[PDB]
């Protein structure tokens, strides 16, 4: 099965998932000098006041904080998007060292981690139908750098010991994802894909320019998670990031000068 190891990592994924070599794969390097300001892009609208978190799950490649998406409660709209996209889950990608971990890069810079807030287009009715469409998902990507702690992340960090291994979940209600957002919503946007198999080309990527700061202790606790299940040999869940993929015939657009 696919993973992030030497024999099953990103360079192998194309054998089971040939779209890995497709025309709109993610992540990508964001060349800040070539990204063009698009004055027709609107401000992002992030409406998370009614978000209902339910559960946190170690799925063997990251941990997902899942939300009730059976109603319009936490939605992303505006920006490059047409219509309304409902928050379904968020998760992170991170490194074994502070010098790597993000999936997107900025002028080849790798951040310590990257948060993905995943939303699906309500016109397709559910997530499973949305991923079959070129405009089915909108993923808000936020870089993490190591410095001061992020207070709004600590409730996540503190539950990780209860979901150490693949397949473990824990109740995780009343978590407010607004506490994970930077001050500015300036962003880059481009059409891309899921960054894990099945690598479907269904994502409008919206990557925020401003990183959030998290403490060394916070990211160190991400690195204590396990890829393996309980009672299997311990493999630390680190370096669960796909590297940048060829941009091909795409343009990255900036919301800001
Ligand atoms: O690792 C990732 N796996 C995903 C899997 C399913 C998604 F809906 C979105 C993503 S993602 O591209 O945001 N990141
Ligand atoms: Zn992701």
UniProtKB/Swiss-Prot annotation:
Enzyme class: lyase
Cofactor: Zn(2+); Co(2+)
Enzyme Commission number(s) from the entry: 4.2.1.1, 4.2.1.69
Consequence the record notes for mutating residue 59 to V: Reduced activity
Effect of residue 59 to D: Strongly reduced activity
Modified residues (Phosphoserine): 162, 169
Amino-acid positions noted as binding substrate in the UniProt annotation, renumbered to this chain: 195-196
Consequence of substituting residue 59 to H: Reduced proton transfer
Biological process terms in GO annotation: angiotensin-activated signaling pathway; carbon dioxide transport; morphogenesis of an epithelium; neuron cellular homeostasis; positive regulation of cellular pH reduction; positive regulation of dipeptide transmembrane transport; positive regulation of synaptic transmission, GABAergic; regulation of chloride transport
UniProt binding sites for Zn(2+): 91, 93, 116
Consequence recorded when altering residue 62 to F: Reduced activity
Impact reported for residue 114 to Q: Strongly reduced activity and sulfonamide affinity
pH effect on activity, per entry: Optimum pH is 6-8.
Effect on the protein upon substituting residue 62 to S: 2-fold decrease in enzyme efficiency, as determined by kcat/KM ratio, and efficiently inhibited by chlorzolamide
Mutagenesis / variant outcome for changing residue 89 to P: In OPTB3; in Czechoslovakia
Keywords tagged on the record: Acetylation, Cell membrane, Cytoplasm, Disease variant, Lyase, Membrane, Metal-binding, Osteopetrosis, Phosphoprotein, Zinc
CC cofactor note: Zinc. Can also use cobalt(II) with lower efficiency, but not copper(II), nickel(II) and manganese(II).
Effect in UniProt of substituting residue 61 to G: Impaired activity, not rescued by 4-methylimidazole (4-MI)
Regulation affecting activity: Activated by X-ray, histamine, L-adrenaline, L- and D-phenylalanine, L- and D-histidine, L-His-OMe and beta-Ala-His (carnosine).
Top-level division of the source organism's lineage: Eukaryota
Entry similarity comment: Belongs to the alpha-carbonic anhydrase family.
More info: Target of drugs used in treatments against glaucoma disorder and breast cancer.
Entry function: Catalyzes the reversible hydration of carbon dioxide. Can also hydrate cyanamide to urea. Stimulates the chloride-bicarbonate exchange activity of SLC26A6. Essential for bone resorption and osteoclast differentiation. Involved in the regulation of fluid secretion into the anterior chamber of the eye. Contributes to intracellular pH regulation in the duodenal upper villous epithelium during proton-coupled peptide absorption.
Name the UniProt record assigns to this protein: Carbonic anhydrase 2
Organism encoding this protein: Homo sapiens
């Amino acid at each position: 099965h696919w993973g992030y190891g030497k024999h099953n990592g990103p360079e192998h994924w194309h054998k089971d998932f040939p779209i890995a070599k497709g025309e709109r794969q993610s992540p990508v390097d964001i060349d800040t000098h070539t990204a063009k300001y698009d004055p027709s892009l609107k401000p992002l609208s992030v409406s998370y006041d009614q978000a209902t978190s339910l559960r946190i799950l170690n799925n063997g490649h990251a941990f997902n904080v899942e939300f009730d998406d059976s109603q319009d409660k936490a939605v992303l709209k505006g920006g490059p998007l047409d219509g309304t996209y409902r928050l379904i889950q968020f998760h992170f990608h991170w490194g074994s060292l502070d010098g790597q971990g993000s999936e997107h890069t900025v002028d080849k810079k790798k951040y310590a981690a990257e948060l993905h807030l995943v939303h699906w287009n309500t016109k397709y009715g559910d997530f499973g139908k949305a991923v079959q469409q070129p405009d089915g998902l909108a993923v808000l990507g936020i870089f993490l750098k190591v410095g001061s702690a992020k207070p709004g992340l600590q409730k996540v960090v503190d539950v990780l010991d209860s979901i150490k291994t693949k397949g473990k979940s824990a109740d995780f209600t009343n978590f407010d994802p607004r506490g994970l957002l930077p001050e500015s919503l300036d962003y880059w946007t481009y059409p891309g894909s899921l960054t894990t198999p099945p690598l479907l080309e269904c994502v409008t990527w919206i990557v925020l320019k401003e990183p959030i700061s998290v403490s060394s202790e916070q990211v160190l606790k991400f690195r204590k998670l396990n890829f393996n299940g309980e009672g299997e040999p311990e493999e630390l869940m680190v370096d669960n990031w796909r590297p940048a993929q060829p941009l091909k015939n795409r343009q990255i657009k900036a919301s800001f000068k």
